[PDB]
Design a protein around this ligand. Structure first.
Ligand SMILES: O=C(O)[C@@H]1O[C@@H](O)[C@H](OS(=O)(=O)O)[C@@H](O)[C@@H]1O[C@H]1O[C@H](COS(=O)(=O)O)[C@@H](O)[C@H](O)[C@H]1NS(=O)(=O)O
Ligand SMILES: OC[C@H]1O[C@@H](O)[C@H](O)[C@@H](O)[C@@H]1O
Ligand SMILES: OC[C@H]1O[C@@H](O)[C@H](O)[C@@H](O)[C@@H]1O
Ligand SMILES: OC[C@H]1O[C@@H](O)[C@H](O)[C@@H](O)[C@@H]1O
Ligand SMILES: OC[C@H]1O[C@@H](O)[C@H](O)[C@@H](O)[C@@H]1O
Ligand SMILES: OC[C@H]1O[C@@H](O)[C@H](O)[C@@H](O)[C@@H]1O
Ligand SMILES: OC[C@H]1O[C@@H](O)[C@H](O)[C@@H](O)[C@@H]1O
Ligand SMILES: OC[C@H]1O[C@@H](O)[C@H](O)[C@@H](O)[C@@H]1O
Ligand SMILES: OC[C@H]1O[C@@H](O)[C@H](O)[C@@H](O)[C@@H]1O
Ligand SMILES: OC[C@H]1O[C@@H](O)[C@H](O)[C@@H](O)[C@@H]1O
Ligand SMILES: OC[C@H]1O[C@H](O)[C@H](O)[C@@H](O)[C@@H]1O
Ligand SMILES: [Cl-]
Ligand SMILES: [Cl-]
Lengths: 69, 67, 67, 67, 68
């Protein structure tokens, strides 16, 4: 399973301005609803975490492909 | 150097007293976070959200800085 | 792990292409920065701001991601 | 004492005041940054962005500079 | 870990003759904002010497420092 104890929560306060190349994407996560602002956190193959605006539609297809695979 | 990176925000503090002997480092959460918080790091690299308004925490923060 | 920490921004870009053999890592600058930028880290631990519009810059980033 | 190195900018200041004896050093941010900023260095080498307008920030800088 | 409001290092004159490589301790390339592109070699005597980045030996010294 997955343990979720007293542990910091990953929240986004600033999204990327430029669309990440999909072939750089390795995985995705979504910020907890407790966060003040929404956000999607893409994990690049270089293991970098990038905040992305979920309202923007390029991040939404990226999630679709990741899930539907 | 990292950019557009998520910000660590505590939403649940630990109620107990942490053995200071286990503490290795500390980080106070961002002001952008909805609530204040301090993240202690243990020697097993385990991040723990702690309440800054509580007082065993600032003592740990003080001793970590004043050193 | 940090909070209320400064952000790396590029206000000028290198005029010469860095030999790829020197490249250790890369970091794209924050969207909050006034200008676009890529920060290449060399093996001598030099931090160089590069123009993301240059094709050699885009290639280096691609190679680092696909490795 | 510079190069085409990235620049330290502040986009988020700390809300509450830092205890003074935590501060080890300071330096203002470049004017090229979209926002003004004062970066306090703690005794644990941790960098904190501070609002130059705030009363305590100006006082901390004053004390550091008169030593 | 980044720069502030200070004076950027610029080279307005390079060096005609080649520094003995075993004198070189480190190197820094000047900003592109400068008029002339330059390389600053730091000697073991902690001295700073400007150098033409397009010269044969300068590129070699930088290469040897990086690949170490
Ligand atoms: O030599 C080549 O053909 C390689 O691809 C070229 O496109 C690169 O030119 S660059 O874009 O114009 O400046 C060359 O630098 C490159 O030589 C490389 O060798 C390896 C492998 O390349 S990578 O794409 O396959 O993985 C690597 O160390 C560098 O990518 C590059 N190093 S080099 O020796 O400095 O040129
Ligand atoms: O305050 C530091 C800031 O750094 C930026 O690079 C991030 O995108 C923000 O999420 C963060 O708040
Ligand atoms: O993290 C576990 C620790 O909890 C503390 O409350 C106890 O006093 C310690 O004995 C124990 O090691
Ligand atoms: O297409 C989007 C582009 O964004 C830039 O910021 C990156 O440096 C490129 O690698 C990428 O191709
Ligand atoms: O802000 C004033 C500072 O003065 C320095 O000389 C001291 O070393 C610090 O302990 C103090 O915080
Ligand atoms: O600092 C001494 C330097 O001497 C040079 O000749 C070497 O190439 C470097 O690896 C070394 O760092
Ligand atoms: O001497 C060689 C150098 O001369 C300078 O005036 C130019 O700006 C550079 O492009 C050139 O590399
Ligand atoms: O001005 C003459 C010099 O120009 C430099 O840019 C070249 O690297 C040298 O080879 C040449 O001797
Ligand atoms: O010592 C290294 C040598 O490398 C050669 O490629 C250069 O032409 C010489 O100027 C230099 O002295
Ligand atoms: O040493 C200088 C040489 O380094 C090599 O890695 C590349 O071919 C160029 O950057 C240059 O010709
Ligand atoms: O590519 C990175 C982007 O983010 C930066 O904020 C720039 O304002 C924008 O022009 C650039 O395209
Ligand atoms: Cl929040
Ligand atoms: Cl800016």
């Amino acid at each position: 399973a997955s343990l979720a104890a007293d542990t910091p929560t990953a929240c986004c306060f600033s999204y990327t301005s430029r669309q990440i190349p999909q072939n750089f994407i390795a995985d995705y996560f979504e910020t907890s609803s407790q966060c003040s602002k929404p956000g999607v956190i893409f994990l690049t193959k270089r293991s970098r975490q990038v905040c992305a605006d979920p309202s923007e539609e390029w991040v939404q297809k990226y999630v679709s492909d990741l899930e539907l695979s």
